[PDB]
Amino acid sequence: MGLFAGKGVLVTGGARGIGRAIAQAFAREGALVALCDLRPEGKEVAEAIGGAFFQVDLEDERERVRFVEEAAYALGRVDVLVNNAAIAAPGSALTVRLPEWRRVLEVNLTAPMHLSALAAREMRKPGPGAIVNVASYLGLFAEQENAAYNASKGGLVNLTRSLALDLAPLRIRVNAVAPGFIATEALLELIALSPDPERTRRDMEDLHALRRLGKPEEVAEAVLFLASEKASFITGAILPVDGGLTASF
Amino acid sequence: MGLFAGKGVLVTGGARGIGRAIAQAFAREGALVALCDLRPEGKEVAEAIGGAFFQVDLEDERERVRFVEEAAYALGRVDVLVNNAAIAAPGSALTVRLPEWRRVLEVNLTAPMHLSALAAREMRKPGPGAIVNVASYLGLFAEQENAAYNASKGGLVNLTRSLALDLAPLRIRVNAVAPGFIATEALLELIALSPDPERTRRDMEDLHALRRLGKPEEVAEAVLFLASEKASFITGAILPVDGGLTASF
């Protein structure tokens, strides 16, 4: 069978985009996948891959406790957690409202911390565990009018290193991916509703050495690698999956 | 006469350690300094340097608004903000309590964002403005059992870049210092608590290429430089003031 045959894999934000691609890639490799999402259409992603769906608002700490408990019971084991779910609140420090800023911090930074602790408790039971955080090139650099996302992804990058150090004694590896521009529905919607879609997309493509957008499946492959025993000496690493975005200007 | 003659400078956490050294260094260079702190001894630091003291819980958004308003009124202008105030909550993701984690994020990451926005509104009035964030080597690396501090200083590093980008059009430069081990009362307390204080201190010294602890005044000099017109082409920089700590293992 496959790389994750009979392993329990938790994927946050699995209803679409990179999270859906991650849930599919794990299920292709024989994993029992529990995905959560705020969007109820995540039910169909779980049905199609033979996994479990949990409708969960990751802003709420009680719902995060419930998700890991119920996922663990449904799968019978937890081997991998992927912290994929994330939101943004448009605006500079000047423009963003404090409640919106705090919600971005809660979902993007506090939830991955909390879920990593909850999942880590389930990961001691069988053999070794792995966590992969989906960061962004915007955890390592800033862009205009995106303070909450930049700050939270920055925190997630150093939280990845913190978890790597603190969970090594439990035989858990913790790594992150930093995607470049990935052609998820979220990004294609933003492009589509731009004044000049073709020009916007061309300009985004041109920021990458590969001169194209990434596919969600390409981020999934990097997550699968970092979650697998092929990455047995990799922990605390931030892997750019950005087509060379962060290698030049 | 001096580098900040007649400039208004806001310093958070000015009651002792690096914040006190920063407030003194600005006053030596002719600044009108408004420092805030929870600790009442901040009153004496202000009296000694000819500045204003505000007793302020930076956890509370109303108190942050009050501090910048009252500081601005007392000084007659705001030219510089230093986000120096910070806390830690001992523990891994496994051990730290969610409310303590959120308070570290509020003080260490949300407060600098909020104060930067409030201060930036006061800085348009005169000539150019500068913000300096006191981060840490633990914004760029993790250590054991310090998840909240690691995550919040990580966020502060990328928030520095975000503010740099968003405030550049307002002629406001935003930089950070990443100190190594600095001989503040906070660090001497930690050392004093160990079974063999001198051995603990020696072990900390040995992590630095300079084989000593930093002085608070040495961090103050880097902050003064980054706040000054000598750093007119420096924005979005994280300057290590760590005696070579982060240059090797």
Next chain:
Amino acid sequence: MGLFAGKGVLVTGGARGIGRAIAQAFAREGALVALCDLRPEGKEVAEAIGGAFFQVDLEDERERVRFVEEAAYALGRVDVLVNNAAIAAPGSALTVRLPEWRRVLEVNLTAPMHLSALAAREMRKPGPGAIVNVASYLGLFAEQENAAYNASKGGLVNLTRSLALDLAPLRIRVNAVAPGFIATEALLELIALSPDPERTRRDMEDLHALRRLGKPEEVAEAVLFLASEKASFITGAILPVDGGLTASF
């Protein structure tokens, strides 16, 4: 027939350590492997894996040209180059002799550049190409008395980004691995001949979050991943394979 079935793979320094493990991992995945080395025992590594061996001093530009020409002819195609071969010259700037410093730069930095150009010309012919540079944690940080190695691995890291940008139009991805302490014969010899072998090894292990040395095979897996189409949106990346060495102090 495997991940590299029928692909031509060039591996420098393949006679032992990480290079040998890389040559084996590619051959296990069905590659035609041409490895080169200064050591004639590399003949046996090639015989054992069904590959070709070329005895080559990579210091000499004529021998680098000969290696790629002869490898290309023997394999019938070039799909992957691994720049694994490297030397050190003990000493600070104060202690290292200029000719020894220049030889380290020639083997560790100039050779990978030159081989990448030669290999890239062969990689146009069939489908896409990949280059993986074996850097080190000492390309991103320094250690005492190792200036030539630190400088050359530093250069190799930015050369990896340069090649990523310049070879993207030829459909060639270029990435690096930055290994931590890997238990190759070279490292075990250094430990073995140390005043207190067990203490030396323990101290090296303790620098890693995983509290052990890496295996050459663990570096090989990361190289295979970066060389493969699973890493199709990964170029210009430096991937630590260091058991969390660079994530903390």
Next chain:
Amino acid sequence: GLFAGKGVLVTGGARGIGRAIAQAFAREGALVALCDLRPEGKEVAEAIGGAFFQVDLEDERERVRFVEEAAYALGRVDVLVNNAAIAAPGSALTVRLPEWRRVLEVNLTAPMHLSALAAREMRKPGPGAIVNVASYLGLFAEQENAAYNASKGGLVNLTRSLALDLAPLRIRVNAVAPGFIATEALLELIALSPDPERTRRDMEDLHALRRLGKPEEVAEAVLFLASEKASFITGAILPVDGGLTASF
């Protein structure tokens, strides 16, 4: 006077950032020895009360001669600035091996060698400082500039290596990573383009400050890192890039 009576060696001092560095040190009371291939360096030395040495930093004998003669002329060495650098246009595919090796020799081997030579002179008085002028292109790549990218990359990690190895000699070693600075070198490149104002605007737009740097702004960062105000700063790479490397 921050460097009153200090001996300061500046490579590539004939123009651009090197000239601005030599002027800034002299303004702060330093005895400045600058070297350059360009003879106009003589005028920069005369104007600031310093010494000029015409020196091809590619040649190891000329590097030994420069530090010896500078040391004798100044009476002491307190600071070295490795500012001199060259580029060789081309990718790995396009650059010629000899041009690649010359860029490595001038940009990476010369700073190493000069740092060792200068360090030997710095033990004599109190503490010493070295500042390397790197680039944003030591931390990132751009198209068709492999030799410059590779050499500035090496210079960044050499800065850390020297920081560790020279800390015991009480020598601090730091680097600046400038963004686009309006030196004659950059204004020449701009001037050559079909639409110089558009080329300059495009360069400006890469910086959060939406302007080119002044050579004097790099000089101020070098003065700071060379000074006792930076007494706890060693092995640091300080971007002086108007926020260039903070975003894309």
